[PDB]
Amino acid sequence: LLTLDILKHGKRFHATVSFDTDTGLKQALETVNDYNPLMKDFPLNDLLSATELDKIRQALVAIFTHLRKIRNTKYPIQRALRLVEAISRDLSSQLLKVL
Amino acid sequence: IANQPVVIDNGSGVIKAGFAGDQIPKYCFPNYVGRPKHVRVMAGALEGDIFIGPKAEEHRGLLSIRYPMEHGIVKDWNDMERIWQYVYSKDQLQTFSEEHPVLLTEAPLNPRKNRERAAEVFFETFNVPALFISMQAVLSLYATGRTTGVVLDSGDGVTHAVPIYEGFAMPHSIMRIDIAGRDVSRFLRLYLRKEGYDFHSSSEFEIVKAIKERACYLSINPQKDETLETEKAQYYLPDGSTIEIGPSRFRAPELLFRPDLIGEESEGIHEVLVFAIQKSDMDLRRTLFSNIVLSGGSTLFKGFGDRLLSEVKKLAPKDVKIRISAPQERLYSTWIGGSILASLDTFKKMWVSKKEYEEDGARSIHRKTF
Amino acid sequence: IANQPVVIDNGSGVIKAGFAGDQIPKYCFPNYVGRPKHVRVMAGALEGDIFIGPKAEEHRGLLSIRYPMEHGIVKDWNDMERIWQYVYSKDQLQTFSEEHPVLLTEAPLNPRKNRERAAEVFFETFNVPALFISMQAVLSLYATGRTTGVVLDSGDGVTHAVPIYEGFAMPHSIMRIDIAGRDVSRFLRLYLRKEGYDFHSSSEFEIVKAIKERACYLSINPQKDETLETEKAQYYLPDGSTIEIGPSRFRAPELLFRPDLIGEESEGIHEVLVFAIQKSDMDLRRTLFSNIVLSGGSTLFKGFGDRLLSEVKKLAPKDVKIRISAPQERLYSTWIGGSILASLDTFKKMWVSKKEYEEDGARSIHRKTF
Amino acid sequence: DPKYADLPGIARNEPDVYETSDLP
Ligand SMILES: Nc1ncnc2c1ncn2[C@@H]1O[C@H](COP(=O)(O)OP(=O)(O)O)[C@@H](O)[C@H]1O
Ligand SMILES: Nc1ncnc2c1ncn2[C@@H]1O[C@H](COP(=O)(O)OP(=O)(O)O)[C@@H](O)[C@H]1O
């Protein structure tokens, strides 16, 4: 920050203003922390680590209950559908795995 | 495509330009077109008909200068096209018009037609990839490293005060008055006619501009100084003549603070600043008084800001801290700020697409005007 | 899942919230949604389109204020949701809306829809584990030690009187008028217009509130100062202007004691309390006259206690001892009572679980309303 | 400074901040 302070003292406002507005760090931290509780501790490992059909269903149950944190995370609708289709591909992968 | 964008300040008397990402405008030349008014006989004479650029000042005793932009509004569009092509000429930038995003400035509250026609020029004659037109105030705030303030500038033809609070501009508090540098110079020319010098030619008018920039100075109390005789500066013409100015050296830039002298019911520059503040809200008045940012070449008068403090202090409420910041690069604040805004990615998310302009036209720029 | 329940004093003038067990409410920000009025031009300006609390109190001039709740009844649910989200935000609590029980107060006699929609918000948008809606009278008794008394609160939007005796509330004796602090500020605004000072913007409405809180008092007599036409005490504005008032710093708060000035037949605050006491049982009058509790910010005017005493003394039967307990926490009494109630364990039995609401709905809230 | 010399017109030797005095 002191470097930016020196630049502000030397009035070389190009660097300071570009560093304060062009760095997408602000919206990045916002959107990242926004999706932080949903993308945290996801039990998808249970599907890829399941061997029994019971565990397949149990993994789906736990995953779908974990997926309820949506309102508090603002995840995009269509992108959520994309992740859903990825979930089913993990499902079908484990289906042929147990199969 | 997006190469290094170009910033052009259409100063109504001095156009300032250069690329973005720079730090100073290396292309500063007065705004006019000088055509010769004499007869050509000797082969091997000067070159070309128009004389935009430094060649004008080099051979001003031949030309017949014509100003294209009067009071920020362009009258002779062909001259502005020639000037803009001269900005892209081999002596100024050497780039091609189809290579850079253009950041054109504009005096606030200019007629709609001015923006429209400028769009036509930059997208039909020049085929620029992108174009953005903004206020001159915002740029000065960028160049002065701030976010809140009242940019009170004085270009060569338009003075105005734009109060911007925390990056949010208040449009209904914008005060614009068309009395700047050219009117100060014109009034000084009239005074020299009454002093017996009869400057009436075009080159003589730019000599008057040189006098205004060098010998005038502002008053403190024009009556205290009116009752007493003054220095009576001795300015030397390029010919070698000698001119004396007398009390008009302080009476000439009085037109800014008082347009009654030129016979015009309008407001002073102090009234513009004070009204521009008071047209806004109440919670912001104190902060706007504490942050007054000047710019514009016609604020470089010696002894100007001190009189501005006495004037605004005489008008503003009791004991409010009025704080005027006047940097050294006032002449290029709009350019430097244009370089700052044009050296960003938000600028890419802020200009007007050439395709979108072709699809829409005037409505496009009037939507993205802010 | 529960750890330190979140007490929320959903007041139409200022929302006070914090965790349970806290002796003092940590966050008391005003109840309004501030949206900007002036376009953003300069990049790097303020972020977001919704300003709540501390930010919408410093940049007040830039904003337009929309009160969500008026007269204890929510108008825009969107705004209340945003304010509650602000309460759980990083700058206020850093908690989740699923880990703490929520005690949200409410004025008495509000429509059922407020209770329904309030719980719908706290059970659908927020996945609150436990919600309990209370009265804004019992809580003041809790935070004042007493268990028998007449709670006479005057918030910014709704004043009422609830006679509670030995922990038993007598609901049929509840009197409630919808004339409070908002109306006093608004009527003060009309008095300034009659004194030549207009205010129409929403951002300048809080300056009217500022005048009220810093310069309004209550005369012990309505005519001993009326025809006297007293001095005009000056009062400074946030910019540096000057307002002299005179007959409005006492004429504006008499709207509480006589709402005929606003053009509405109703009962004054004194008649609210006296009628709430007289509607109760014959044996319970002396204990209610000797136990009067004050709450709400409108009960902070100068000379309010003396006026309230003299009015009740005129309306009460002769020689009855009238004691009006007036604590110093009239603004935070209801909240402190909420922090006490939520810190108990009977509150666990008093709330509503999430599945309770899912299996029942609004019915469960109207069941545990008292 | 050289950057503020190379240009034609610049306020050389002038106070940059104009402000009223203290004693409010
Ligand atoms: N040292 C000076 N003293 C007084 N006036 C000056 C000085 N330098 C420039 N000016 C005035 O400033 C004008 C330059 O106009 P300018 O402010 O550059 O317009 P813009 O800022 O819109 O380019 C000149 O015409 C001249 O009248
Ligand atoms: N010191 C004061 N003197 C007089 N009135 C006040 C003072 N402070 C606040 N008020 C008024 O009382 C209101 C306080 O709101 P409050 O009574 O808490 O409403 P609520 O109970 O609905 O939150 C403020 O909006 C203002 O109208």
Short mmCIF file of N, CA and C in Angstrom, two decimals, chain A residues 17 20-21 26 33 37 40 68-69 71-72, chain C residues 43-44 47 90 96 98 124-127 354:
data_model
loop_
_atom_site.label_atom_id
_atom_site.label_comp_id
_atom_site.label_asym_id
_atom_site.label_seq_id
_atom_site.Cartn_x
_atom_site.Cartn_y
_atom_site.Cartn_z
N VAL A 17 -5.11 4.57 -9.84
CA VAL A 17 -6.49 4.41 -10.26
C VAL A 17 -6.69 3.09 -10.98
N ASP A 20 -6.89 0.48 -8.37
CA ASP A 20 -8.07 0.44 -7.54
C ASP A 20 -9.32 0.07 -8.31
N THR A 21 -9.34 0.24 -9.61
CA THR A 21 -10.54 -0.11 -10.33
C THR A 21 -10.37 -1.24 -11.31
N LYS A 26 -12.19 -6.94 -6.26
CA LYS A 26 -13.37 -6.61 -5.47
C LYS A 26 -14.53 -7.52 -5.81
N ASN A 33 -16.75 -15.22 -2.11
CA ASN A 33 -17.29 -15.42 -0.78
C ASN A 33 -18.77 -15.70 -0.84
N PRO A 37 -20.06 -20.73 0.93
CA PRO A 37 -20.72 -21.81 1.68
C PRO A 37 -21.33 -22.91 0.82
N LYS A 40 -18.55 -25.47 -0.34
CA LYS A 40 -17.78 -25.91 0.81
C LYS A 40 -18.36 -27.19 1.36
N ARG A 68 -28.99 -27.40 -0.94
CA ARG A 68 -30.07 -26.47 -0.68
C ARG A 68 -29.59 -25.05 -0.41
N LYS A 69 -28.32 -24.86 -0.09
CA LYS A 69 -27.78 -23.54 0.18
C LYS A 69 -27.60 -22.82 -1.15
N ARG A 71 -30.06 -19.72 -2.03
CA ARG A 71 -30.50 -18.34 -1.82
C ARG A 71 -29.41 -17.49 -1.21
N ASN A 72 -28.67 -18.07 -0.28
CA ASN A 72 -27.57 -17.47 0.43
C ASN A 72 -26.28 -17.46 -0.36
N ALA C 43 -15.52 6.34 -12.68
CA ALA C 43 -15.28 4.99 -12.23
C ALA C 43 -14.61 5.02 -10.87
N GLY C 44 -14.79 3.96 -10.10
CA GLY C 44 -14.20 3.96 -8.78
C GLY C 44 -15.04 4.72 -7.78
N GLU C 47 -19.95 1.91 -4.50
CA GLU C 47 -20.44 0.68 -5.05
C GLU C 47 -21.84 0.37 -4.55
N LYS C 90 -21.77 -8.87 6.90
CA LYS C 90 -20.44 -8.86 7.49
C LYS C 90 -20.20 -7.64 8.35
N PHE C 96 -24.98 -16.41 10.16
CA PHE C 96 -25.80 -17.02 9.15
C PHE C 96 -27.22 -16.95 9.66
N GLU C 98 -29.28 -19.24 9.86
CA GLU C 98 -29.69 -20.59 10.18
C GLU C 98 -29.13 -21.06 11.49
N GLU C 124 -38.44 -18.57 4.98
CA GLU C 124 -38.22 -18.91 3.60
C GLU C 124 -36.95 -18.26 3.07
N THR C 125 -36.83 -16.93 3.18
CA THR C 125 -35.60 -16.32 2.69
C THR C 125 -34.48 -16.61 3.66
N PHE C 126 -34.77 -16.50 4.93
CA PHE C 126 -33.82 -16.84 5.97
C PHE C 126 -34.29 -18.19 6.46
N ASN C 127 -33.38 -19.11 6.71
CA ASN C 127 -33.81 -20.41 7.22
C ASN C 127 -33.55 -20.44 8.72
N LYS C 354 -39.04 -24.73 12.96
CA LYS C 354 -39.24 -24.61 11.52
C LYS C 354 -40.26 -25.62 11.04
#
